[PDB]
Structures are given as structure tokens and as C-alpha cells.
Amino acid sequence: MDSINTRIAEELSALPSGRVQPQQVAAAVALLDEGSTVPFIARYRKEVTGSLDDTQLRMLEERLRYLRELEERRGAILASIEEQGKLTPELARDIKLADTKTRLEDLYLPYKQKRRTKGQIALEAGLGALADALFDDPTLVPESEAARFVDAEKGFADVKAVLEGAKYILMERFAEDATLLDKLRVFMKNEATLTARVVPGKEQEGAKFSDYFEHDEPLKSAPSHRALAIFRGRNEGVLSASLKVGAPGTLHPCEVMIAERFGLSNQGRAADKWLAEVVRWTWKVKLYTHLETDLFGELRDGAEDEAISVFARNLHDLLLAAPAGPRATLGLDPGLRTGVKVAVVDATGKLLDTATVYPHAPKNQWDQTLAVLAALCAKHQVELIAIGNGTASRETDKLAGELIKKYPGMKLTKIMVSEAGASVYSASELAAKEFPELDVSLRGAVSIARRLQDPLAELVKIEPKSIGVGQYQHDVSQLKLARSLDAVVEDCVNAVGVDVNTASAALLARISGLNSTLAQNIVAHRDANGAFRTRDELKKVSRLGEKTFEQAAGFLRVMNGDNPLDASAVHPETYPLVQRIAADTERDIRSLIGDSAFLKRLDPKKFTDETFGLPTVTDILKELDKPGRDPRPEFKTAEFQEGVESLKDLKPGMVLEGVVTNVTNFGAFVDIGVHQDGLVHISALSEKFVKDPYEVVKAGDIVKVKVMEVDIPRNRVGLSMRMSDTPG
Template sequence: MASSSTVKADKATPAWKIPEVISENVDVSLDVSFNVVKLLDEGATIPFIARYRKEQTGNMEVDKLREISSLVEELKTVESKIASVSAVINSQGNMSQSLNASLRNARTLHEVELLYAPFKPGHKGSLAERARKLGLEPPAMKILDGRLVALKQFINTEEKGLSNEAAVEIGIRHIIADFISKDKDIMNEVRRLCTNSNVTIETSQSKTTSKVKADKENEKKVKDFKKPKDQSYKFEQYFDYKIPVKYIQSHQVLAINRGEDKKILVVKVIIPDFVKNKLTLFSHRKWIHHNTCDQARILIQKSVTDAYDRLIQPQMSRLIRSDLTKKAEKESILVFASNLNSLLLTPPVRGKTVLGVDPGFSHGCKCAVISVTGQILDTFIVHLNYKSQNTFEDQQKIIDAVNKFRCEVIAIGNGVACRETEKAIGNLIQKKRFNVRAIAYCIVDECGASIYSVSDEAKKEMPQLDPSLRGAVSIARRLQDPLSEFVKVEAKHLGVGMYQHDISESRLKTSLDSVVEECVSFVGVDINTGSECLLRRIAGLNASKAKQIVECREKNGAFLNRQQLLSVKGLGQKGFEQCAGFIRVLHDFNDPDIRQKCEETAEPECDSEVSAKSGRGRKRKAGTTRKAKKIKLDENQAPNPLDMTAIHPESYHIAMSFLKELGMSVLDIGQSRFIDRVTQEVAVKGVEKLAKSFEIGEPTMKLITDALSKPISYDIRDSFDKPLFKEGVTAIESLKVHQKLTGRVTNVTNFGAFVDIGVGQNGLIHVSQMKEGLKGHSGLQLGDHVDVEVINIDIKRQRIGLRLIRLTSS
């Protein structure tokens, strides 16, 4: 009993620590792993860790931090599973020291499930459970031990399953087979054998779908019948398909899964006989020994065969499919995340009045003129693409709007009637019908615009505007500031990946939401102009806190500095720490009034006082003093120039000390003379020397110097590819093989990249057609401009094959 009590006491405590497992699996040092896990447990967000805790993470990138965060959650789930399984086994009185040790050392849910399998209550309808209810488990265990059992003593002619000796034997075999199929050693061995053998996936068309298709092909009621309603044509390549598991791609797995769900495909996992033969020998060596009686030998051999055919092989088939699906989902989510990141970081087109056009046929093209500040100046509807007697008048409406508001760019949505609208606008530009000196047009991704136009956010923002016109407003604003507009739409509706309906919705949402948070945070948001949608995406904030910020702004006027965030209801010190560095409070310090206000409320403070209050600052040898004074801005009344930078408030004292040594004023941040002086100091001394001088980490010093050496208008998105402004219009029918074109990547998948080449249908660069030296498909990102060559055209199926020549920009 003492031993049992000891087992129960530590049943739920894993023998491993999460940081140790992270260190082993993600290839980071134990110290870094411990720091990251600690930060995550304390509630730190990934953007905050990535930017402001580089010393603790070893300059770890966001993608790796996200991977660690996901692994931490998985390991916590394993911890919870170990605790619940231990509790169940203990309640049964079946816990042993060896089992407890195995449970405590298990690191995956699969390992825990294998250990729990022999003790899990069986399904009431299973053959083994039925046999157990008949009292056949004791003789079954004796036979498994190699002992002789008189089967006749268990015969009961009035009981089904015990009517004769043969029935008793079958029941005993079912129990032994069930025991073998749940044995941890057996399952580990079969997994090893399957991994090292040529397991294949075979797919074929289901008989039901084939019959439906045949019936529809014979049906003559619909003359121009092209695509059967059963959509089976989409899976034709898998109607007679076979591929080794080790070579199957993630997109193929997801496509096969979808075809199976729709009852179009029949999928089989073919495990070679080699696995069965090897596993049978392994099982015999484990349970059949020299002293095993003949009766037990025969029954065990039959039970092993039954266990494999009826239980183990189907279980392994399910496990292989499950592993493939998990891997495919993970890879697909990574593609989604990468594409979304590129889409959100599309550079804005600033300082231009834009005419947004939401194309349409019968209902016309919805148009909206948007000012440089995003205000709606005019809205109207024209019919450019529909047979109408008013075509000339409608064209004149476009011309008048462009000329009246001096629009510089026309943004055309890429949905239905896009190419027809593009052609009409292109003709007007070519004929110089506009009086403005320069006018261009651009195709804008309108995915999710229709969803946004009927959302509560759109109703609140544009209450008097018809929903159809709201889409045109969104299209124009997506060109002016893509990030601010895209965050209004749930990420899964932005069309940045494939097979999203075949992926775990919760996992996809978690990953995409994380990417949105990172992009918004790293770009930064002006707290006095940022929308509620944008603010809620900042690291450390949420919907309720963003709402409180907006309400506070509306009630009390514009925020003067970051410190005033602490007065927002519900935003405590922890939330402030997480979000402060990503929020900007922009002021024009060239304005005499603002400059005077800042100077009037500034008060000198010595370094020692700052150190005492903040717990930070430069250390000084005992007995020494320093005459230099540091400026402390009255946080309740004055703007703070540092609030316009990416420097976190916790590092303001370092930034101020640095500027004091340079003899520069914090009020001149962003000016060219200021930037030149900071840049010169960094070039002469180097970041490493400066970091040692201020006794801080090199990453923090680099962040401070980088922030101070950039203009206030600096935007990380400026380094990405600009939107593609096109001049010509082409139809798919006019394409020719070997023709060379320029296009823009609109989607990236595991099997290739889709490119908009301006013909109304995206072309596909398959991975096999990507030039060496560009890292295959992983070298292309959504938004890249590329030179391509047409290699094949299928007008009937609207498919265009392309070969990548080169990236025209990076």
C-alpha cells in the first residue's frame, strides 16, 4: 500500500520540464528556452518578445517564437492528459511504478494514449468486451502466459458465445487480440516498420459518384452541359492514383481528404505484407517461449494474425492518415501565414486621391472617390460593361469625377467584370479623356470586401451609404492603406491560401490572428487616428480595450503622450507594457505652439533620481557625480517626442542619456540634422561599444539608435513591393506559348505560385518551373513582381502554365 500511495502522490507530474523539451525540439539553448517560456507564461505577446526582449531570446525571429508558443500549448495539453489518465488508472487500482514512470516520461499525446489503451474502458459492443462480460478474460490471460486451459469448463449451452468449445476459443482469441493491439511495444514496432517500408496511398473514384456522372452524361435535357453538379471533375487526377506516403505533398493530402468527404473518392492505405510478417515474428518472440504449451502457442499465433488484420492494420491506416493530415494542415497554415503577412505589409499609396471601382455587369460598377485622408468625396454607379444605351454618359461620369476631384489613381476590384472594366478605363486613359496631368489604374484584391460592406463595422462607419457602394470605398482605401482596411475583415476571408475549409478552423484562426497582430504592431498605429479595428489588433490590446481607448479619445480629446494610456479603463500596467512600444503619438514639433508647450512642461532631473524611480539607468562608481541633467517630460501635460518612435518607454532614460552625450535635443527627433548626428555617432563608435557604455544589451541599443536615425514618416512597409500599376490589357485568347510577360504573385502554395498577368485568369508557376537559385517556391512571396514565360494554355479549362524567369524586385 505504501508503494501505491507513493505512485499516487506524483502521478500527475511529468518527469520533464517544458523548457527542456523546447530546447531539444527547436534547437535553442536551455537558457533561451527558459526565458521564452517564462515570458509566455507571464502573458507577454509574441510581437513584444520579438522586439523588446531580444537579449533574453537571442534575437529570435517571430516565426520561431510562434513555433515555440504552439509547442508550449501542445506540451501543456500533454501535461493535462497525463494528469487525467493517471487519475483514471489510479481509480482502477491498476497503477504500477513502471507504468507511472512511463506516463511521466511521455512527451506526446500519442505516447500517453498508447500507455492508457490497455486500461481504457472498451466499447460495449466490441468483440473483446463481449467476451470479457462472459468471464473469458482470466483464461485468456493464462493462455497468453503460455499455460494450459481446459476450455470445456467454460461452456454454457444457454449463453451465446459460450455454446461450445469453438465459441469459447473465439472469445478468448478476441481478448488476446485486443490486448496485443494495445501493447505499447507492439504499436511502437509497427510504427517503426511502417516508417521504414513503402506504405502507399491509393485513391479511386467511388462507384456512387461514377454512376451519377454516367447518368448525367446521358442526360440530354440540358444542351450546353459542361460541369456536372457533383463537381467530381475537380478530382479526376485522383480517380486512379497511387503514391508512396513519403512522397505525397500536403496539398494532395488535403485534396484527397476533401474528395473523400464529398463521397467522390475512395481512399486506401496500403501497408506491405513485409510489415505484417515482421510484426508477427516480433509478437511471437514476445509471447511464445520454449515452455509455452501447444494449445497456447496455437491460440496466440491465431490471435496475433487476428489482431493485425482486424485491429492493428486499420488502426495504423487511420494513424497514417491522421499524421499526414496534421502535417498538411501545419504546412498549409504556414503558407496562409506567409501570404497574409505579405498582403498586410503591402506598401500604402499615400497622398493620392483615389477613385475606387467595384466592377459589375447588370448592377453596374459602383464607384467612390476617396480623399488623401480617406474621406468619402463622392459615390455613384455607372454601367461600363453592360449593353446599355447610356454607355457614353456613364463614361462621362467617370471622366467628370476624376477631373473634378483631381484623382491620380483608379483602383479597380479584381472580382466579376474586372477585365471588362479595366479595358474601359484603359481606353479612356489611352484616349487622354482625363484633364489631369497623370492618371494610372491599379487592380486591387477585393477579397472580403463584400463581407465587410454588410458588417457592423461598415454600418457604423458608413451608416448612410448603400452596402454596394461601401465595397467601392473599401477598394479605394485598400490601395491607400492596405493594413488599415484589411484588418476590418476576418483574415480567413482574404483569400490568401488554399484548402482553408479542410483545415482546423481554430488552428487557422489562431495562426492568422497572430500574423495580423504582428503586422499591425510592427508597423505601429497612431493612437489619435487609428480605428477601433486597428487598435484591437495591437499586441496587448483587445476589442474591449480598443473600444475604451476610442471612447476616451472622443470624450477627452487627443492623447498627448503614451503615459496617458494608463488612464484608460481596463488597461493596467501589464497591458501598457505590452502595447506602448507599438503605439505612436504623432505631433508636429516644428509647430511653435507644440514645441513651446513641450519646453514649458519639461523639468530637469538628474540621472540618480531617474534611476531611483525607474530602477534603471547607468551605474556610477561610488563617490562620483555627474553634472549632466536629463530632461523629464511632464507625462500628464506634454507631448513626448520619443512617443513617435519604436523606442519603448522603459528605455526612454537610455535614449535621453544618449542624446545628452550627443548634445542633441529630443525635440529635434526626425529632422535631417538630428538623424545625421545619430548616424555618425553609431558609425564611429558602433552599437556594441555604445551598449557597453550604457550598460545595456546590444539589441536594445540597436533598437534605440535605429529608431532615432529614421524619419518620423518611416514605414517598414516601404521596403516591400509597391502595387502594380498596369498599362496594357490582354485577354487569355491572345496569349501565345513562349510569350514573356510581367506579373504579380497573388497566391503562394506548396505546389507553386499563382500570378496575375493581366488576362482575367491567374497563371500557375509550378514548382518544377521555378528557376534554380531562387530557393524554389519558398523564394516567392505574395506581392512579388516576376517575369514569366507562358508554357501552356488551356482556354477551355481556363488554365495557364507559366515558367519563372526571374524576380523583377525583391
């Protein structure tokens, strides 16, 4: 559909990544529909899409779903209205122009199946004539008109009940008007104060929400975190939330709009006061609550999106952090009364020992604990201490600090690591399979040790939405959460790629085009038939068809096999092309690999064809130079803890701890330990808009910076605090 392609193109054009044409969107959609994954499309179909990247494609994917839902619904609405003989051309046009689901449903209201409501009941008793007569002629006396309608048997036993019935008929009719709804919604959005008040008597119980006990701010500007705090407090009965503009005996501005919409003016005619009563009730019973639900919903969606957007960035950072590699590690899972849980893993990640020690309050067995850890480190040649950042993490870091101090000879290094998902992991079936005889409390420590060695490999074991990377994570839409965090996992796993002969099932499942079943099939196959010698041998794995092979092959590496290309991200579909490059250059493929200078000299344009354009060939030449290059930076933590790194040794991509030495109105200068400050420009200080560097950082602040550029001749280093920034 053109309208969809165009719409998505423009939404995509509104990103910093720039202009995208409808033709690009159209191609990507077709690719996605046929079953191509985002990573596959981002990497191997750049020509078809104009080089849309992951971020661009994920968004396209999301907007494609929404817009399709919108279009499908729009159709059903037209069909339903036509079926009721109510599809005027005017209304048809309105439905055509509807840009949102909300606008669409508004227009549908009068034609929707009706519930057994007071108005509906009243109409069945014939009070429609009464409501009409009174609305049409306000000089009629409500009570007098109402008499001929009284019928106890139909549920309306007196004038009073008749008039209430008639009132509800007008109310519901008034409340289903699309033009008024939009007007009231827009007005409320632009003018209403979001109002949070503590529920009387829960001042202690809801002490966490004390900031919102008497809180007011514009609805249209309410930021994500306050919004999520308020809805949570409201959700646990501690707070109440409402919208205010708006009994001082004052007319609400929306009551005015309702009346004006329906040509009602209180001129003192016999029916005027009843009619104003109708308006008042329409507002207070139907419209306010309808609009509040719409506006609360919209505020929530927006705030959750923003919050989830932060979780997604945080997990991404976790998945792509420099692996410490095959080094013996002591994992510490901190705690107080439940103690510090301890695991020791060898270089391969194999568990060697465990313990539970109680160095902190209340047992305070500090020295005993130090002796235990010292003994473990010694008999297992531990190099690294991995410490989870949960409860008592600060006291545990101090403890490790004292261990290192007391035993310099061991040359230990301690690193703070995230506890994200450790507890969920330890209670999982996978973990129960991995360590059947190991207590649940001890499996966390194991995961903490292993995530230091290799965060990617360990964290893919855990259900992505359960990797807790922020506040309110459990409270947001879980569907939105999984949709976002799965995407992150998929993108990080495929960017790195895996050795198909060593990767776990959990890791294989996240490879483009694979799943749990295929992952297990692969692992079973290499267990039964030994290592795969080439990529093509994957075609012999059960259920691993041609379509699947296409999606996954480029991401699965065979190290040291019959074909040197299988160790790179060069796709098998382009093997003939690289064989043409070898023919033209009269060199065998094995000699090309690693020959940086020669490859650099090559002209990609000499080798493009109709299918494989310039993006593909240039990509191929990069891969020939450095096959399956790992996008993650080197681990150099010990080197930076000791302060023995120089500017010379920096690489773009390194994520490092820095200290702010000065803040200016254009950025902040940061010391990463190479005797030369880097400048973090104002907008590089945050993932969000920055108007004032002084609001974001101050001198002395420890920050996380990514090395953007290194200029050794000028002795300069470029730095960003946005992990989303690409050095190049």
C-alpha cells in the same frame, strides 16, 4: 521545466536562424507567461532572450503549448496507471521516454477506461478463461473447450457465439499492445501506398477530383496540395482513401507481424486456424482502421500546417504592401450578371459615390459603363483605380484600360488589388455600422478602394481567418488558422505602429496588449477629451493599467505633442536613458532627432547599463535618427508602369514586378525596368527548397521580386522572390 526549455531550444536551433540556448528559451517563456506579447519581447527584451525575433518567438509559443499539454497528460497517465496498481518501473520508464502524444497514448491503452465492447462483454461472461486457455495451448480444440462456457442467459447461447466472444477478447488485447502498434505504424508509414479511387457513379459529380480517380503514391511522400485535395474529395463523398501494402488468399505483412509479436505460428494444431482467424480479425477490424486514422490524421496535420504557412505569408505580404496614401480612388468590384460594383473615395477615404454597372456578359453595357466611370473620375478628380482580382477581374482590367486610353487627360492609374475578405467585410456589423444605408453589394467596392489607399488600415477591419488568401482556407483547422493569422496581423500592426490619435478602434485592437474594449476606451477618451498630448496621458484611459501601458506604449505614437519621443518607437521605460544621452552630449533631445551624422558618431557602449544593453541603445539611436520609421516601402507603381525609374532610385525593401529574361542552373536574371537585370539566386527563387531553377521559372515569366541590395557605384541590384527575405 528544463526538459521543455532544452527541447524547444533544439527545435529552434534547427531553423536557419541558428543556435538558441535553453537559457534563451527559459527567459522568453517567463516573459510570455507573465503576459508580455511577442512583438513587445521581440522589440524591447532582446537582451533577456538573446534577441529572439517574431518568427522565433511564435514557434516557441506553439511548441510551448504542445509540450505543456504532453507533460500534463503524461502526469495523468502515470497517476491513472499507479492507481490501478499497474505502474511497474519498466512501464514508468517507457512513459518517461515518450516523445509524442501518440506514443504516450499507445502505452496507456491497456489501462484506459474500457467501453462496453464485445471483448468487454465476453469477459463479463467469463470467456477470458477460454481465450487464455486456447492462446496458451493451441492443441486444445476450440469447439470442445468452448462448450463449458455456453450460457444463453449471459448472451452466449452456443459454441459459435462463445468463440466469437473469446476472439474479441484476444483481438482487443492484441490491439492495445504498444510495441506492436509502434511497429505497425512505422512499417505502414514507410511502406504503405496512399490510394485514392473515385466512388463508383460519381465520375461526373466529382469531376474536379479527376486526377485522383485512380491515384497512387507513397504515403510518406504525399505532398500538401494533393493531400488536401484527396481529403476534400473524400469529405464530399466523391473519393475514397485507404492505405495499401498490402482476397488473393495472401497473408498481409502486418498479419505476420501481429502473430510474430504474440508467438503464434500456424503449425496445424487444433486451435491454430482459429488463432490465425483471431489475427486476421485483429488486423481487419481493429488495427488497420486504428492505424489509418493515426496516419491520415498525421498526413492532414502536416499538409494543413504547410497550407496555413502559405496563407500566413500571403496575408503578411498583403498587410505590409506599400500604401498608395491619400489619393482619390475608384474601387471596382468585378462581376458578370451581378455587374461591376463601383465606389469612389476621396483622399481621406470618405465615400463620394457608388454605382452598379454591367459592362460584361450578359448585359454587355460596355460603352455605357465607360461613360459612367469617366464621369465619376472627372467630377471627383480620381487618380487611382483599384480593381479586385476576383471573378471578371480580367475583363474589368481591360475596361479600365480602355477608360485610361480614351481619357489620357485624367492621368488615371489602374492597380489590381486582392478581394481577400471584401465580401465577409461587407456583411459584417462593422460595415453595417460604417454604411447603414449602403447596399451590401456596394460595401465590397468601398473596401477595395480603401485597401489600395492603405491595405493595413482596411484589412484589420476584417476577421483575420476570413481574409481569404488561398485554396482550402475554409477546409483547414480554423483554430490553427486563426492562431496563425492573428499572429501575422499582430506582428504587422505592431511593426508599423499607429498614431494613437487617428487610428481606428479596429487598428488599435491589434496593438500589443490592447483589445476591442481598450481600443474603444481609447477612442471614446480622445473623443471626449481631445487628442492625447503625450503617451503618459494614456494612463488615464479606463482599464488602461501599468501592465497594459508597458505592452502598448512603444507601439502607440503621439505625433506633434509635448514630448518628441512619443513620436518614435523609443519605449517610455527608456526615456531617462535618452535623457542621459542628452546630458552627456550636452544637447537637448529635440536637437538630436534627425541629426544622422552626429548620431552615427555616437558610441552606444557609452550608455548601456544593467537593464538596457547594447541592443536597446543601438535601437534607440536608430529611432532618434528616424522616429517611428514605417517598415513598408514607398508606393512607386505609376513610376514603374511608365518605366521612368532608374537603378539610382531603388531602395532595399521595395517589392516590384519583374520579367525573367534568362534562366540558368544557378538562378534567374530578372528585368525590373532599370536597364540592369538582377540575379535571383537559385534558393531565392522560392520559399520552398529549390533543386532546379528551370522547374520554377522560365524566360518571360512575370514575377514578384524584393530588392535586397542596391549598389549604385557598381550599378547592381540584388533581388529575391522570397518576400520573407530581409534586405537588412
